[PDB]
Design a protein around this ligand. Structure first.
Ligand SMILES: CCCCCCCCCCCCC/C=C\[C@H](O)[C@H](N)CO
Lengths: 245, 58, 297, 58, 50, 58
């Protein structure tokens, strides 16, 4: 009674037969903002099922020489659904998340992925290599949407911080002998009770193969990874025209 | 006793033992903190906890 | 006026933060209990699943035969109070007579404590910090020589006018806080509050502060939190004329009443710039040192 | 306790929380003031007050 | 004179022979009881593990 | 009164009379020690003690 899970939120439902468990981030469940903590006087709209539901972004292919990918939140859902219109039409935003990563393979494949949630994953540059240039990353690479961006130097996570110590944040491991899902439930993390979804990204989702995928030819060489994510306890406030960026 | 409660821990569960000669509480000493830990928050952050003896995957 | 059942039975508006955890007192290290041999089936405390993302709940009472040890080791030195209440260098300002940096008897230094690697890496272990502080100004000559000179240490918050010269009218410090000192006297030392508009400082801001299109022209804004820009610290030689003693002011900051949230991986690569986690991609170094073989030490 | 009541607020409704090491009260600290406001004195100084809902000119 | 807990909580010196068994009287052969049809799941008395 | 018991005699039978203006007890004065002697430990460390009058070798 642990390797099976049914995540039901809204009009969506994910079944799993080869789960590990559910991680709840920093031991806090997602919630709404108190009256003590709030400052804005406007009454926020709390749409409970039209945005709190599972969305499915795109697929990335785990090849042999794959290095890793990251997805910035909530940039993934600003052009997608009733969530991504309210985020455009409003100035503020506050939601938790339930991330779900799927990678199914046989009992003759092997490999491991680290699926980590790093708050405030600020991106660095190679400084031209020499270290002389104070270069900055482009908007394509800082906020890449739902198609994600691949890491060039995954040992340092493209920020100068090591992959080894990333298990101090939230994480699960997708070991193809043991599991094919990873469920992480994230609360809202910010110094502020509310912030804008289009300028500030609250956290990043790292997917890194620590162990390389291996199979003997004859098997299926195409092993996708699909990110599936639900907002939770979402709140919006400050209504004006729709702006994309 | 008459002094502004204006330190960066006023509104925290932890209580301090400070010295101050001013009315501004942020001028006080660092003091002694409370010895309270929460390793379960980072090390076992699971919805369904499992015991030491229990093999976790049934 | 709630009538339907789809809103009476709702959890919307539940502001209480439901936590799975509970902080318990740990003044000393955990004691050890006496353990014996176990020769049974079903219970296997050594076999784990790191795939769950949790850590091992194992003991040494379950894995070896142990004795009762009463641990009287204190956990009081790993507090943030003890780890951060240690005054470190955060800045260094030079007031030379000639040159290129500050040859006109005054110098402004925008507050960032991310110019020296020893205190930066220690705060960049966390993502959010809320603390009071204690700054300390150790002024002297390049040679270390102490001289009879009077200085003015003005704090210029944001919005307030920065001084353009030594004889500027912002030095009158009518509402701005200032400090006057002689260098024959001890170092100055002021205590500071938590002065940000937010509930905490944050050394990593994943986003842009301004709205609008984000091009290569104004790409330097990436990562800039104005909730951390507490302003400018200015310093002059109090006078209507040129001094004759060159000076160097060193700033030493000590935290108090510290709280911190969301630990991060500690940096293993060398810093290159301020408020910027860039690295030299050509010379990537491992976070340890190497061997030649895994079987030979 | 034995000291001249000779500050510029002796004879004021507000009470202070001061420190002094002399007999002259004007040497004491600025202290904490009382947090009492009277915005009605400058902002609604009318003989016949009117409510928010009431359109004032009948 | 035993003071530490590593010797109070000990099983050293346990001379009693701990047995899993018990000899019971069997003067006659075991009798047979009446049995019927079973058409159920979960219980399989014919499948063993040697 | 609120201070860490962190001197090198905390856990000693002897009690001190110290002055301190900090929370660290190792900063306190040396104080007055207790006047207690044990010369029998070095000077007559025998299993079978014998008296002054008793010629020891019987
Ligand atoms: C009389 C002179 C007094 C000087 C007082 C200076 C006030 C400084 C308050 C501490 C500010 C914390 C450090 C600032 C934030 C970060 O280091 C950077 N701005 C962001 O990377």
């Amino acid at each position: 009674s642990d390797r099976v899970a049914q995540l039901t939120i809204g009009n969506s439902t994910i079944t799993t037969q080869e789960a590990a468990n559910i991680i709840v981030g920093y031991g806090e469940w997602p919630s709404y903002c108190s009256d003590d903590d709030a400052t804005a006087v406007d009454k926020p709209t709390r749409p409970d099922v039209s945005v709190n539901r599972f969305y499915t972004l795109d697929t990335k292919l785990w090849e042999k020489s794959s290095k890793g990918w990251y997805w910035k939140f909530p940039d993934v859902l600003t052009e997608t659904g009733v969530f991504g219109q309210n985020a455009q039409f409003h100035y503020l935003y506050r939601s938790g998340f339930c991330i779900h990563v799927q990678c199914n393979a046989s009992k003759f494949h092997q490999g491991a992925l680290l699926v980590a949630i790093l708050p405030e994953y600020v991106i660095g540059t190679v400084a031209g290599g020499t270290g002389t240039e104070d270069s900055h990353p482009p908007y394509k690479q800082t906020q890449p949407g739902a198609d994600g961006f691949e890491l060039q130097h995954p040992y340092v996570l493209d920020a100068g911080i090591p992959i080894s110590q990333l298990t101090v944040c939230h994480h699960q491991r997708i070991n193809l002998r043991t599991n094919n899902c990873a469920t992480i439930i994230v609360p809202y993390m910010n110094t502020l009770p509310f912030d804008s979804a289009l300028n500030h990204c609250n956290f990043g989702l790292l997917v890194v193969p620590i162990s390389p995928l291996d199979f003997d030819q004859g098997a299926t060489p195409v092993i996708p990874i699909t990110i599936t994510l639900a907002p939770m306890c979402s709140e919006f406030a400050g209504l004006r025209q729709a702006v994309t960026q | 006793s008459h002094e502004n409660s204006n330190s960066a821990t006023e509104g925290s569960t932890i209580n301090y033992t400070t010295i101050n000669y001013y009315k501004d509480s942020y001028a006080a000493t660092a003091g002694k903190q409370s010895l309270k830990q929460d390793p379960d928050k980072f090390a076992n952050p699971v919805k369904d906890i499992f015991t030491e003896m229990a093999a976790p995957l049934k | 006026g709630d009538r339907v059942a789809d809103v009476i039975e709702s959890s919307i508006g539940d502001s209480v933060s439901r936590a799975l955890t509970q902080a318990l007192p740990a003044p000393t290290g955990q004691n050890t209990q006496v353990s014996s041999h176990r020769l049974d089936t079903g219970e296997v405390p050594a076999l784990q699943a790191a795939e769950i993302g949790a850590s091992s709940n194992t003991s040494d009472e379950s894995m070896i035969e142990t004795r009762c040890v009463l641990n009287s080791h204190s956990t009081a030195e790993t507090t943030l109070d003890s780890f951060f209440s240690r005054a470190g260098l955060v800045g260094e300002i030079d007031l030379p007579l000639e040159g290129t940096t500050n040859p006109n008897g005054y110098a402004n230094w925008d507050i960032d404590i991310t110019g020296y690697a020893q205190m930066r890496r220690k705060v960049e272990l966390f993502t959010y910090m809320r603390f009071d502080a204690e700054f300390t100004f150790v002024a002297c000559t390049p040679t270390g020589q102490v001289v009879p000179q009077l200085l003015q240490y003005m704090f210029v918050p944001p919005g307030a006018p920065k001084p353009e010269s030594r004889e500027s009218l912002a030095w009158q410090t009518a509402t701005n806080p200032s400090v006057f000192v002689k260098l024959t006297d001890p170092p100055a030392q002021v205590s500071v509050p938590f002065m940000s508009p937010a509930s905490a400082y944050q050394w990593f801001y994943d986003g842009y502060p301004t709205f609008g299109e984000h091009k290569q022209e104004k790409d330097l804004e990436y990562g800039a939190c104005p909730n951390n820009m507490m302003g400018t610290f200015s310093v002059r030689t109090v006078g209507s004329s040129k001094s004759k003693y060159p000076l160097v002011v060193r700033i030493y900051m000590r935290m108090k009443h510290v709280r911190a949230w969301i630990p991060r991986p500690m940096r293993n690569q060398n810093y290159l710039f301020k408020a910027n986690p860039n690295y030299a991609g050509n010379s990537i170094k491992p976070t340890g040192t190497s061997r030649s073989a895994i079987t030979t030490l």
